[PDB]
């Protein structure tokens, strides 16, 4: 029950609740109810990334 996401562009965190990711990383979607910010899971981390940086793969 994992909805996968592709990171489209590098992103550097701007708060302690955000992730830093690189283009091509594959994440899991946790919550898409905010149009601008999605909560995601990657490695052992859970945090936010801007929705514009992500593509749903399912």
From Swiss-Prot:
Transmembrane segments: none annotated. Residues 1-58 form the SH3 domain. It is found in: Cytoplasm, Cytoskeleton; Cytoplasm, Cell cortex. Disulfide bonds: none annotated. Morphologically, spectrin-like proteins appear to be related to spectrin, showing a flexible rod-like structure. They can bind actin but seem to differ in their calmodulin-binding activity. In nonerythroid tissues, spectrins, in association with some other proteins, may play an important role in membrane organization. Belongs to the spectrin family. Like erythrocyte spectrin, the spectrin-like proteins are capable of forming dimers which can further associate to tetramers. Interacts with ACP1. This is Spectrin alpha chain, non-erythrocytic 1. The gene is SPTAN1. The chain holds residues 968 to 1025 of 2477 of the full protein.
